[PDB]
Amino acid sequence: PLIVPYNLPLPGGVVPRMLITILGTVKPNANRIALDFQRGNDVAFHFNPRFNENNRRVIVCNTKLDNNWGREERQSVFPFESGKPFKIQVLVEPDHFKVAVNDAHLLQYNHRVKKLNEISKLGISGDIDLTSASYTMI
């Protein structure tokens, strides 16, 4: 088991055909999960499931540049459940991050930060027990 918040270095940044796999379990009565792909202080891709935003479950995606959040992209398809184990896979493609949860496609997020080789750390936080965080090339 890993301690949350967890920082996974991505040596030399991300590259198309890099696959990041995160395994864990959502805690009971969870409020949030966040994956933050960082370029220094900037957040290239924030993936943020929210379990209770105005009594709705929603996934918020965004980018933070110079300490300012941009336009949110929201997804109402919500594959997570409190108490249950999950697998998140993030596949880096030339023009998008592609996210699958529990082997089902969820969403894609167009690259706003374009210096892919400078996105060199992934922060994982929120109301989860973290089992594994790794990457490979496909």
Ligand X SMILES: OC[C@H]1O[C@@H](S[C@@H]2O[C@H](CO)[C@H](O)[C@H](O)[C@H]2O)[C@H](O)[C@@H](O)[C@H]1O
The residues binding ligand X (CB under 6 A) are 46, 48, 60, 62, 69, 72
Phi, psi of 55, deg, nearest 5: 65, 25
Q: Is 81 annotated as a binding residue?
A: no
Give, in order, the Cα–Cα distances in Å from 91 to each of 41, 101, 137: 22, 11, 9
Q: Is 71 annotated as a binding residue?
A: yes
60 binds, among ligand X, Cl ion, none (CB under 5 to 8 A by kind): ligand X
Q: Which is nearer to ligand X, 47 or 117 (CB)?
A: 47
Q: Is 73 annotated as a binding residue?
A: yes
Min separation Cβ 65 and ligand X, Å: 12
Q: Could you tell me if 17 and 127 are in contact, meaning their C-beta atoms sit under 8 angstroms apart?
A: no
Min separation Cβ 62 and ligand X, Å: 4
Contact region for Cl ion (CB under 5 A) — 1-9, 34-42, 64-72, 84-92?
Answer: 34-42
Verify binding: residue 72, Cl ion, rule CB under 5 A.
Answer: no
Per 3-state DSSP, what percentage of the chain is helix, strand, and coil (rounded to 5)?
0, 60, 35
The set of residues, in sequence order, having a beta carbon less than 8 Å from that of 54 and lying 6+ positions away, is none
**Residues of span 73-112 touching Cl ion by CB under 5 A:** 81-82, 93-96
For Cl ion (CB under 5 A), the number of binding residues is 15
- For the chain, what is the total number of helices (H) and then of strands (E)? 0, 12
129 binds, among ligand X, Cl ion, none (CB under 5 to 8 A by kind): none
Count of beta carbons in the 10 Å neighbourhood of residue 76: 8
Binding-site residue ranges for a beta-D-galactoside:
69-75
